[PDB]
Design a protein around this ligand. Sequence first.
Ligand SMILES: CCCCCCCCCCCCCCCCCCCC(=O)O[C@H](COC(=O)CCCCCCCCCCCCCC)COP(=O)(O)OCCN
Lengths: 489, 788
Amino acid sequence: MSNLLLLPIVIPLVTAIVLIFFPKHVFWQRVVSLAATVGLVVASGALLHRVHTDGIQTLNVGNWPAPFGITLVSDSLSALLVLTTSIIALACLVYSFYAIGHKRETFYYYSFFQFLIVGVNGAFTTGDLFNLFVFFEVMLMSSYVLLVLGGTKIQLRETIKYTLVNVISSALFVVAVAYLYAVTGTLNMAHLADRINALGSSPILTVIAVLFIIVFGLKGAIFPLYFWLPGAYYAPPTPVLALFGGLLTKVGVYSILRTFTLLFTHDAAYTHTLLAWLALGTIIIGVIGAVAYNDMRYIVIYNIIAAVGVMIFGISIMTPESVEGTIFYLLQDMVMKAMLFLFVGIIFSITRSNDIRSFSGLITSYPLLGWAFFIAALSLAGIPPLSGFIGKLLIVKASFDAQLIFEAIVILLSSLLVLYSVMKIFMNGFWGEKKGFEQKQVDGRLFPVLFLLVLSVAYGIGIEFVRPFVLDAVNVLVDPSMYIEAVLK
Amino acid sequence: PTLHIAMFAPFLLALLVPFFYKCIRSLHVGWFVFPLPIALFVYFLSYIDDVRNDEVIRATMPWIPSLRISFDAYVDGLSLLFALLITGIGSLVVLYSIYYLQKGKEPLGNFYVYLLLFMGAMLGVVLSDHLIALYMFWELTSISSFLLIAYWFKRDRSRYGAQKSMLITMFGGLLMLGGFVALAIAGGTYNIRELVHTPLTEHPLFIPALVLILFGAFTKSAQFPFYIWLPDAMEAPTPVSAYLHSATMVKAGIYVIARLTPIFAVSSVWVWTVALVGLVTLCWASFLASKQTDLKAILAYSTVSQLGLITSLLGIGGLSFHYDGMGENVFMVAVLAAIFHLFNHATFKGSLFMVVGIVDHETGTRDIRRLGGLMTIMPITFTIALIGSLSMAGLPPFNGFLSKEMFFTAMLRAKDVAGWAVILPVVAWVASIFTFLYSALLVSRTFFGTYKPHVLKKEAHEAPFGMLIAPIVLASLVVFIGFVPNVLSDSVLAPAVYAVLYGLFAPNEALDVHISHWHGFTPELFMTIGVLLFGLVLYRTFPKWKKIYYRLSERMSLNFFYDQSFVWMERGARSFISRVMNGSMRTYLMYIFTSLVALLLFTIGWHEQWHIDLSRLAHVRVYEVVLAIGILAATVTTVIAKSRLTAIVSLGAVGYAVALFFVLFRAPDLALTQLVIETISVALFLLCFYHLPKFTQKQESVRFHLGNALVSLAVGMTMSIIAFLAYAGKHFDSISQYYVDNTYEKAAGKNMVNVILVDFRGFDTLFEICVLAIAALGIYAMVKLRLA
Ligand SMILES: CCCCCCCCCCCCCCCCCCCC(=O)O[C@H](COC(=O)CCCCCCCCCCCCCC)COP(=O)(O)OCCN
């Protein structure tokens, strides 16, 4: 009944637990994880229809009232993020069936997979700050182990780096929760939002909001807090990397979004001009890194950084059109970055090399993969029949309506430069004569990538279907009074 | 509505092409592509009766109705002119490509898929009434043209040309999108025909929309300085060159300028920007077109020059909107001139490309210095080339007479509003001189001279008739609008002028009696005679001023600047990431810590930080003082320790004394768990110590760097002062009266830390159990799995 909201959290959790008992039986690992992920997708779709039909769904964990126990809240944005997470998880799991070798999946691989999706799905639906802390460490601990699993020298080194950074940011989130508890005295989102709005003219709230910016920008890579991410994402294997690029940096973006649309609304001018300048720096760093490299993984990594910057710039304007555009761009960018890492993995499987300058002439031997990557590149850029057009269109329109000409031109030129990076991959890798590779039949793993591509194309065609969910999400984001009268009954 | 299945029919047939291509192996696939443009052309002949008697055709297909986006379609005179051009020259280029390409040596299904995507995209560009739909069709045009230029992907220069054309036209298209969005905010709506009936100059977003739309429209139609991509798009197949770079894509910016002229030509920035950049690229391409040594580069710079002519006439036709002195109304003539030469250019330019394509695969070369006497070898294509070149030069019996005399008539009557504009026609005049030169040189170094029986290929150079069909039809249409200019004017060209100059015709008889005007002694006649005589006396002496012309053409170009600009951009970005991304973790920690300190201290210093209330503070007691002195001693001996065991045992002492604080601040559970966890963790540190490698170990002290010490003191004092500011301000109390009031009355417990951990907030204890489980499984996986 009303526990439907926990079915994105409970279903992978149970699954991860029962995958501990039989490590050496890889067939039943695959069967149980596949069936549970399909059930996760079905339950998340049912939750999205539930939050669409009647109102926002709130569940107290015990029978305890709203300030005093843990409350889980699913609005329409969190349900959309859960469904997007479920689709990405299913595609990455089937790619994991074809891609991960035998030895790495005898040692608890699918358990760690399910714990990572537990962490992200719990992070998108929570109503407490410290519970959100705990879900961040579930997510981060599973990401540490998935990064290090296999134990070659490269992933040892960058697991040390990645672990060091996330320990520092975890301690910083602890001290931020401590400061905010000393000011307010509560721990759930809605009641401390009410308490912050009861004393909104104090400077310490601005200082703690800037501290949350620093923490969540260490989580999802903002300038000047991005520096850990290139080597850390250059380390892991391909489906693990698709999980990381699809999911990990985008929960920091959602946390920034929830923080500045729910908690900190008084004295908005300083916080929003800070977000604007950090977002502009993030976009510039991302497009410079995308132009600079002749290496596929680095190109997709800096495209992650650039798209995060565009989303943060959409957050930095308190207009419903900009919020609508960054929600559209958020969903399609999660799906698209997971898709592009799976493409890069297939191309590396063919070429036995990651250098763009080493190989050419893949259209003459792999036409479906080539034209799929062509459509994926043009959908990443923002060409209008494809997915990522209406998001940046609404962002550009909301920036022109608020008199930001230069920043809108920065967004459009960033779209140009990210198109140049991915089309550099396409034109130097797929076109040309044949010199770099040897004919090797790919199998199986192409189909989850094609499934993601078909869903992205159908997303770009069918904006009118997927829009009223985003409209209810915008109606709850730009008005937190409905959020705090839904929880605090 | 029957036009919805006309706009989206080339896309469906582009879906169906490879089916017919690999399932019908006998018949050439282009024949199956052949009827559809024919059908569209015949369908587009069905609207002329409704457009002559000033009636328009409107259609709507909604796409996102809540974001207020549709595929609108609006059909009037200008859109019919462009649609008839697209479909007629499309069917002719399809026929020429049937007879040009081969069957068992060429991928043909790719060719006709790309071409038919381009045709559907261009028909969508022209017919569109919605701005976002227009931008969508614009982008599809750019992508399909990018595909068509690189048709031979196994050769380098095609990929260079496709990359450069892609980057330039995408840059223009994105700034075009920004201008469209600014215009749609300036007006209330998105549809073009409702932006006309509303005022837009009293709005701040009018000039940025003007500059961005104008920037994209100059980028598409190869204006100055953006003409750079069009001479390198000549590595395409010859039907691609003919169709795209004669009639369809290079006129899209022309269509946008002519379409939005009733909105933006009320300002002077639009009309003078358009006119001046048209004159500049006319003269610049007319100068540069005589340097080249192959046919297609000459025709590419020719295309750039006549596009500049058309857009300069569009600028003077924008000057028509302000005022006309006492019913003179002369500037409207410029509009007609533009539209006439627009239509005119398409026809002969298409034929000329087809001509050079023929002679290419009838000789093997296309350079000007190997092919000589081809008059009595190839008479029919010589006739077609002579007709096209004399029409391009601007000579009396062919089309170029009316085009050039209306051009000089429009330019001479436009200098009578400002004195500096007296500079403008004579500059344009020498452009025509330059024009004649290359056109004369074209024919006079293609077919004249003598035959070379040693380098050439074939004893018989007789061309097939099927290749020759479409240039004959284009040359016949050239001759027909030459000798009979009245019927095509009164049928097509007049409602185009009534479209471009909307809301301005209070009478309509002056335009009609100027269309019916053909002869009468004009002062522009001896101007054309002087063009002819000076081009004749300039061409005969051309091997004398040849070196001066070659070195002055070397003296200024624009591909040098673009190539070095991209080398600069990639090298600067690469040196940026080689500077700031060093790889050392110490440096990135310095950047993160410094940014943390800077943002927090600036946020504190920006405010005034009032209301320091020391009344919350508790009374200090001696035991906490002595224990604080103890853990300060352990902290100081763990930062200044020479060996690492000393830092390990000092971290242990810090842990046990934090446990003693937990005892002393009334926290028993914290003390128990803290003692056990610190004993286990210190055992793990001693595990990590004694397996250090014996080489390069050396047991050295902590190295002192001044920046690390400054950053560390700033971090500590920053979080200290934030803790003091937060703890001693205004506050709401807490929510723990409920937990001390309902631990036993509602739950079953007397302990309160444990009841919070398992009953009130027990939902997060489950996931810290999960964190410990992941940690143990990960330690097992790291130790046991050693695949390397
Ligand atoms: C005071 C704590 C009160 C609570 C009681 C806690 C008791 C347990 C504390 C943690 C125990 C960890 C045990 C680890 C193994 C230690 C013995 C083996 C290692 C060893 O001898 O290392 C030497 C010890 O450090 C040295 O020789 C220098 C040691 C410096 C310790 C500094 C402690 C400051 C505390 C300040 C007051 C705090 C009061 C709190 C109530 C380093 O020397 P090496 O390199 O020569 O090794 C000799 C090579 N054969």
